[PDB]
Design a protein around this motif. Structure first.
Motif, PDB file in Angstrom:
ATOM      1  N   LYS A  64      -5.551   5.649  12.708  1.00  0.00           N
ATOM      2  CA  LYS A  64      -6.425   5.674  13.665  1.00  0.00           C
ATOM      3  C   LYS A  64      -5.738   5.613  15.100  1.00  0.00           C
ATOM      4  CE  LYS A  64      -9.286   2.123  11.025  1.00  0.00           C
ATOM      5  NZ  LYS A  64     -10.102   0.973  11.128  1.00  0.00           N
ATOM      6  N   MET A  75       0.880  -1.046   0.060  1.00  0.00           N
ATOM      7  CA  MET A  75      -0.027   0.120  -0.118  1.00  0.00           C
ATOM      8  C   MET A  75       0.795   1.214   0.039  1.00  0.00           C
ATOM      9  SD  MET A  75      -2.343  -1.503   3.223  1.00  0.00           S
ATOM     10  CE  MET A  75      -3.855  -0.411   3.026  1.00  0.00           C
ATOM     11  N   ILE A 115      -0.773   2.079   6.794  1.00  0.00           N
ATOM     12  CA  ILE A 115      -0.741   3.324   6.336  1.00  0.00           C
ATOM     13  C   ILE A 115      -0.625   4.500   7.234  1.00  0.00           C
ATOM     14  CG2 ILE A 115      -1.343   5.123   4.491  1.00  0.00           C
ATOM     15  CD1 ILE A 115      -2.671   2.784   3.093  1.00  0.00           C
ATOM     16  N   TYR A 174      -7.166  11.195  13.037  1.00  0.00           N
ATOM     17  CA  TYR A 174      -7.538  10.280  12.037  1.00  0.00           C
ATOM     18  C   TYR A 174      -8.132  11.070  10.886  1.00  0.00           C
ATOM     19  CZ  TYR A 174      -9.296   6.426   9.433  1.00  0.00           C
ATOM     20  OH  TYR A 174      -9.777   5.507   8.389  1.00  0.00           O
ATOM     21  N   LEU A 175      -7.536  10.939   9.707  1.00  0.00           N
ATOM     22  CA  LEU A 175      -8.250  11.767   8.536  1.00  0.00           C
ATOM     23  C   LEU A 175      -8.243  13.214   8.704  1.00  0.00           C
ATOM     24  CD1 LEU A 175     -11.133   9.359   7.479  1.00  0.00           C
ATOM     25  CD2 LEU A 175      -8.906   9.605   6.967  1.00  0.00           C
ATOM     26  N   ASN A 176      -7.655  13.927   9.429  1.00  0.00           N
ATOM     27  CA  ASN A 176      -7.393  15.418   9.586  1.00  0.00           C
ATOM     28  C   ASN A 176      -6.231  15.446   8.576  1.00  0.00           C
ATOM     29  OD1 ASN A 176      -7.836  15.676  13.311  1.00  0.00           O
ATOM     30  ND2 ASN A 176      -9.093  15.571  11.604  1.00  0.00           N
ATOM     31  N   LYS A 177      -6.385  16.786   7.789  1.00  0.00           N
ATOM     32  CA  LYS A 177      -5.571  17.085   6.893  1.00  0.00           C
ATOM     33  C   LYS A 177      -4.996  18.667   7.075  1.00  0.00           C
ATOM     34  CE  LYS A 177      -8.769  18.490   3.376  1.00  0.00           C
ATOM     35  NZ  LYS A 177      -8.274  19.903   3.474  1.00  0.00           N
ATOM     36  N   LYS A 179      -2.346  14.114   5.182  1.00  0.00           N
ATOM     37  CA  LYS A 179      -3.464  13.716   5.760  1.00  0.00           C
ATOM     38  C   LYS A 179      -2.880  12.452   6.489  1.00  0.00           C
ATOM     39  CE  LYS A 179      -6.922  12.485   3.049  1.00  0.00           C
ATOM     40  NZ  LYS A 179      -7.640  11.563   2.274  1.00  0.00           N
ATOM     41  N   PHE A 235     -12.157  13.064   3.964  1.00  0.00           N
ATOM     42  CA  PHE A 235     -11.342  13.467   5.144  1.00  0.00           C
ATOM     43  C   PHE A 235     -12.077  13.932   6.030  1.00  0.00           C
ATOM     44  CE2 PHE A 235     -11.426  18.044   5.662  1.00  0.00           C
ATOM     45  CZ  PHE A 235     -12.221  18.565   4.318  1.00  0.00           C
ATOM     46  N   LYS A 236     -11.619  14.135   7.376  1.00  0.00           N
ATOM     47  CA  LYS A 236     -12.427  14.521   8.427  1.00  0.00           C
ATOM     48  C   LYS A 236     -11.953  16.009   8.787  1.00  0.00           C
ATOM     49  CE  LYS A 236     -13.250  12.361  12.170  1.00  0.00           C
ATOM     50  NZ  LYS A 236     -13.101  11.886  13.566  1.00  0.00           N
ATOM     51  N   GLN A 237     -13.057  16.843   8.672  1.00  0.00           N
ATOM     52  CA  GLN A 237     -12.736  18.321   9.353  1.00  0.00           C
ATOM     53  C   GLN A 237     -12.360  18.112  10.725  1.00  0.00           C
ATOM     54  OE1 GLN A 237     -16.294  20.332   8.413  1.00  0.00           O
ATOM     55  NE2 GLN A 237     -15.820  20.780   6.408  1.00  0.00           N
ATOM     56  N   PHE A 238     -11.426  19.042  11.160  1.00  0.00           N
ATOM     57  CA  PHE A 238     -11.322  19.248  12.381  1.00  0.00           C
ATOM     58  C   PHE A 238     -12.518  19.519  13.383  1.00  0.00           C
ATOM     59  CE2 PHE A 238      -7.025  20.360  10.771  1.00  0.00           C
ATOM     60  CZ  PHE A 238      -6.111  19.452  11.417  1.00  0.00           C
ATOM     61  N   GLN A 241       0.824  21.445  15.605  1.00  0.00           N
ATOM     62  CA  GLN A 241      -0.491  20.953  15.354  1.00  0.00           C
ATOM     63  C   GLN A 241      -0.657  19.385  15.236  1.00  0.00           C
ATOM     64  OE1 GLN A 241      -2.048  22.443  11.784  1.00  0.00           O
ATOM     65  NE2 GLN A 241      -4.190  22.496  12.478  1.00  0.00           N
ATOM     66  N   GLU A 242      -1.728  19.028  16.114  1.00  0.00           N
ATOM     67  CA  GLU A 242      -2.032  17.577  16.153  1.00  0.00           C
ATOM     68  C   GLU A 242      -3.000  17.288  15.190  1.00  0.00           C
ATOM     69  OE1 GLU A 242      -3.276  16.137  20.095  1.00  0.00           O
ATOM     70  OE2 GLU A 242      -3.964  14.344  19.332  1.00  0.00           O
ATOM     71  N   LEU A 243      -2.718  16.267  14.315  1.00  0.00           N
ATOM     72  CA  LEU A 243      -3.577  15.856  13.192  1.00  0.00           C
ATOM     73  C   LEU A 243      -4.017  14.453  13.505  1.00  0.00           C
ATOM     74  CD1 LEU A 243      -2.405  18.119  11.790  1.00  0.00           C
ATOM     75  CD2 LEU A 243      -2.062  16.531   9.725  1.00  0.00           C
ATOM     76  N   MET A 258      -3.317   8.858   8.394  1.00  0.00           N
ATOM     77  CA  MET A 258      -4.208   7.670   7.743  1.00  0.00           C
ATOM     78  C   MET A 258      -3.997   6.694   9.211  1.00  0.00           C
ATOM     79  SD  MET A 258      -5.199   8.628   4.936  1.00  0.00           S
ATOM     80  CE  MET A 258      -5.612   7.107   3.922  1.00  0.00           C
TER      81      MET A 258
END
Lengths: 140, 140
Positions: free
Chosen positions: A83, A46, A59, A96-99, A79, B66-69, A92-94, A81
């Motif tokens: 969980k 992947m 991922i 799951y699926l934050n971008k 982004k 994607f997930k918005q914050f 900045q903390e990202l 990926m």
């Protein structure tokens, strides 16, 4: 002869002397078409760049090129990926699926990894390159 | 039993009676993992949804979840993948590799195509669905 935008990535890990980066080639620019999406994680099928680590998700995150409005050069978006573990872009903390859109120079921290990213602007927008450097020192 | 976020897409084209949408199945929700990226264009090997049209680029655009914050549901981002033709998101023109976060309801116009997009929020963030409806009428 057209210059190509390159994302220089200096990476570090305390257990990097165990061959975690054995799958990664250093000082080698790899050309990617602007249609591609670069993926990082433990899964070889992947992800283009893989780490031999149980603590690394299949991922971890993805880097994709894009053109900012009113700009003739490539930029990059990240982004998360994973969980399980967060992804730190600078302060900045990202989750799951934050971008986020990346600046020219930033620091990536996921788990115990440390990535210093620096974008060198080129002319081409049909493709981009990636280059890796290993740091014996920690990056922060 | 967990509800799944679905992107309802009502589409129209003046020559749709020529089988341009013969490759597209209607009233059928297709599940996609949140890792996937949905692509549109004429090329069958590169795009999940394809149109039999010379005026359509190999890849026209891509939709990625994607997930918005501060949000527990999936949202979507679009990115124009066509060097030739622009991509209109409502009143906004998206050039080559330009991208935007989509609202709940918007209109996509590329060439002579017209897409009405509506996001129905579900609970799941590991996957999303897509559903298509053909409109005999134009959408604007």
């Amino acid at each position: 002869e057209e210059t190509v935008t390159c994302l220089q990535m200096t990476i570090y890990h305390p257990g990097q002397q165990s061959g975690i980066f054995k799958s990664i080639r250093f000082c080698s620019k790899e050309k990617f078409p602007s249609i591609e999406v670069v993926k990082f994680g433990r899964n070889s099928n992947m992800c283009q760049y893989t780490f031999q680590d149980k603590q690394v998700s299949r991922i971890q995150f993805v880097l994709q090129p894009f053109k900012q409005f009113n700009s003739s050069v490539l930029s990059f978006e990240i982004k998360n990926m994973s969980k399980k573990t967060s992804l730190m872009v600078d302060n900045q903390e990202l989750g799951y699926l934050n971008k986020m859109d990346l600046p020219y120079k930033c620091m990536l921290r996921f788990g115990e990894y440390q990535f210093l990213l620096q974008k060198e602007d080129g002319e081409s927008v049909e493709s981009f390159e990636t280059q890796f450097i290993m740091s014996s020192r920690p990056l922060l």
